[PDB]
Design a binder for this molecule. Structure first.
Ligand code: UDP
Ligand code: UDP
Ligand code: BBK
Ligand code: BBK
Ligand code: MN
Ligand code: MN
Lengths: 5, 491, 482, 5
């Protein structure tokens, strides 16, 4: 997954 | 065709609700129940800087073709994405919304949305994935400007104008909003940090970098200015359609989930373009921990394709970080190479120097590099200097006082400081000292399949058992676990 | 006277080893007056030839009940390691040592002139006395427990010869207080400080480091000088107002002069090819502390002095004295304001916003409030405090908010036991509003009986808990604007 | 006291 800001 | 507020959400969503007392996280790896409770045009906090809020945005801007790609997306989330775009965007700027249905089980999910004003639905008759789907949608796009979005996004106040402003001025600019966080459990809309740049480590995994205090400070003047980023997240960006096509669209041989963000980011920068994060632009995104739809393979494959084409020699540092990847077949990269030639792109070295200089790059002759790992613990200077002891600290990949190198001179250096065997007596504390090539006490060799550190010209091994009693010691080499050390990059 | 090597050390040194000096005297005394030491210089320095028309220096060494062996060794190191024609004189200032012979005896030595103080004056006053007596064009200051290295002096003199407003220092090698081993220091360091005005060593920024890679032995701009060891143009020293004459015994010295030099058009340098060993110790052989520091702060720092007081509130109470001449001096010199200093000289110094209520680290015992490298929608925690203030850097804003960068402690859920979250700061978010209570020892969530609580740290992260007498609810900012 | 380099 893309990681959260 | 129907106006978005006249669209019957209850009827659309209702077909596919979570039932009985079944698991709400099952289908999507986010809380579907909580998503479905939400109104299609639900209110969300204005997470913008005050300065953006006090701003008249030009509307004399090229219209955009919004491309949204999806595969077995939650209806409520999908609808919500679409309505957010329609509701929050000046209409004349929204040429069309292009829904690319990537072989969803139920074609109605997307087809039904086709009733909606400016919504066009394109349905893949087989699973193509995110990259290929996007291209299809882009290809179908009528507008001058392309906008890419995920299928579980929520657009914020005046999100579009700042983005368009940029690429209108300069068509080589590839721009992104700040990506707010939409909580996967309770679906709360959370404002993200604006003090972040895109980035990566040598394992080529995407990560969020904080801006340097240097950078931060220099912006104090204008805090909502564009931010140069060496890399984009990837889900959410805006791009000139012609430019997109010119630069070689997307790498067409990549698969399901990449990887693609990596490649495009390099390509854009290297080939004379730029990458921006735009703070006044805010778009909510449902971040999750896992995918709902081999993963390590496909990822490695695509990552490889990117690395092999763009990174030049520096690709090796990747392989050093991830050796298993040497084995993964990636395929034919001929066109991509030709493409690079044709475009007259700069070399990776240039990219590193000018775009991503904060990326810590090993010396070409370094034997090993990065962090010195012992379980979840790392070798650490403890902020100590010369004549200072040394220790362990839980690893944190912020690589600072955990940044180490194994040099060609057989030395274990941090900055211009070196692990020094001050005293050969077992149990003896080692010391941090100014690196001298002539100094035999500073000489170290890797042993037992690069899992230990032996003091050259001795039966002595770097040992952490004394960490709690003064610091890292030199102990007689043996099968103890406290003598286990592994560099994150090996060459 | 007598030639240094003809000097009878055995006889001189003749009259618990840590007691008298807070370093190992026995180990020091074993040492030969001219003992060999490793060349700790960068290779590039080694391979280098020097002027000759360099101005000579007057070496000023000040001391109070110094160990004879150490003192002697300092003096002979100067003589032995320096081209003689560059050493005009060595000025020994005896700062009311118990035994006047300590210094007097050394007076027999070539180029050595001993000045005794008939009462305890301290380091600052003593230096001035010595400087005043100095005949050379160039002043060199050293501690009384130093060891000069190979070609230490030339690179220092080279600099101030070219430009007389340059105030320069060697890299200060480390002499081990226990075993007296001469250890090569890091060259990657700048001088610096925190808002408590306590001297500290900063690492260079990777930015800086990298930009030097071209020439690694180049001068290094430093916002602050250690203080013990430096070289200065005699006239310039006098012009800029010597030292503050009303300062006393103990430190603050480095501080005042460093500000003054920079602010008044001069510069501060560390010079890597210049290497001088120094016996570092843990303790002295506490309010003067605050006094002197105050005098410096009150004169130079302008409004920013408050940040000092915020870090050290006990200091508000300490009387410092009359600072009239010093103020006049600053006027006269047409010096820049402190703001300028911060912006241009020491920008890496983390400076609170002007409206901020509190600042710095959020301390709970030896533990600190820490982001755990988490970002938005992220939980928050504790971590043993480390004064490197990064993910431990916090602010209590005028908007009643507890912010790290542009992120804010957010009360997501009012239910006791509920985990708090990191969220993008909004001024109009009530959930983000915090008040200090119980004598600035706690953090109460505004509009509630809820208190910031660490008891849940190991079980998920910092929580919001019902305000009570628990220790886990104890929080103190390092700087308070109160 | 000053702290070692
Ligand atoms: O085979 C696929 C897999 C995913 N997607 C879509 O492309 C995006 C993939 O990003 P995702 O949200 O799945 O991952 P994340 O944002 O966590 O990186 C989403 O909009 C999906 O709906 C797609 O079109 N085809
Ligand atoms: O009243 C005093 C106190 C100290 N000193 C001297 O000033 C120098 C400053 O170094 P010190 O050891 O006091 O401090 P440190 O180097 O630990 O910072 C030493 O040579 C002392 O012998 C002095 O001349 N007069
Ligand atoms: C005293 C102490 O442990 N300090 C820590 C260091 O040892 C490193 O882990 C730093 C990361 O760059 S952070 C932090 O300063
Ligand atoms: C993940 C983790 O270990 N986090 C740590 C932080 O919480 C701070 O202590 C950092 C120092 O600036 S260091 C380190 O990154
Ligand atoms: Mn997504
Ligand atoms: Mn000293």
């Amino acid at each position: 997954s893309t990681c959260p800001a | 065709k129907v106006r978005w507020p006249d669209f019957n959400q209850e009827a659309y969503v209702g077909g596919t609700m979570v039932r009985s007392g079944q698991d709400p996280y099952a289908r999507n790896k986010f809380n579907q129940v909580e998503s479905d409770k939400l109104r299609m045009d639900r209110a969300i906090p204005d997470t913008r800087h005050d300065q953006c809020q006090r701003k008249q945005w030009r509307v004399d801007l090229p219209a955009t073709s919004v491309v949204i790609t999806f595969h077995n997306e939650a209806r409520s989330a999908l609808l919500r994405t679409v309505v957010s775009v329609l509701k929050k965007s000046p209409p004349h700027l929204i040429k069309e919304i292009i829904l690319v249905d990537d072989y969803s089980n139920d074609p109605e999910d997307g087809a039904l949305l086709g009733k909606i004003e400016k919504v066009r639905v394109l349905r893949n008759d087989r699973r193509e994935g995110l990259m290929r789907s996007r291209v299809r949608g882009a290809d179908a796009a009528q507008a001058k400007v392309l906008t890419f979005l995920d299928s579980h996004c929520e657009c914020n106040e005046h999100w579009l104008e700042p983005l368009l402003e940029r690429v209108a001025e300069d068509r080589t600019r590839v721009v992104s909003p700040i990506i707010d966080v939409i909580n996967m459990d309770n679906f709360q809309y959370v404002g993200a940090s604006a003090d972040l740049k895109g980035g990566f480590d040598w394992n080529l995994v995407f990560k969020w970098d904080y801006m340097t205090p240097e950078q931060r400070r220099s912006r104090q003047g204008n805090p909502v200015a564009p931010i140069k980023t060496p890399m984009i997240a990837g889900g959410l960006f805006v791009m000139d359609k012609f430019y997109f096509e010119e630069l070689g669209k997307y790498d067409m041989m990549m698969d399901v989930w990449g990887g693609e963000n990596l490649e495009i980011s390099f390509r854009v920068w290297q080939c004379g373009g730029s990458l921006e994060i735009i703070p006044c632009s805010r778009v909510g995104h449902v971040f999750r921990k896992q995918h709902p739809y081999g993963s390590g393979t496909v990822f490695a494959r695509n990552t490889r394709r990117a690395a092999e084409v763009w990174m030049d020699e520096y690709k090796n540092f990747y392989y050093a970080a991830v050796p298993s990847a040497r084995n993964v077949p990636y395929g034919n990269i001929q066109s991509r190479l030709e493409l690079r030639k044709k475009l007259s792109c700069k070399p990776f070295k240039w990219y590193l120097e000018n775009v991503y200089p904060e990326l810590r790059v090993p010396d070409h002759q370094d034997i090993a590099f990065g962090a010195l790992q012992q379980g979840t613990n790392c070798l650490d200077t403890l902020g100590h200097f010369a004549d200072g002891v040394v220790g362990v600290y839980e690893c944190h990949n912020a690589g600072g006082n955990q940044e180490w190198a194994l040099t060609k001179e057989k030395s274990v250096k941090h900055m211009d400081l070196c692990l020094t065997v001050v005293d050969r007596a077992p149990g003896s504390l080692i010391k941090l000292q100014g690196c001298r090539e002539d100094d035999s006490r500073q000489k170290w060799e890797q042993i037992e399949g690069n899992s230990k550190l032996r003091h050259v010209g001795s039966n002595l091994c770097l040992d952490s058992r004394t960490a709690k009693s003064g610091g890292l010691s030199v102990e007689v080499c043996g099968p103890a676990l406290s003598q286990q050390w592994k560099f994150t990059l090996n060459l």
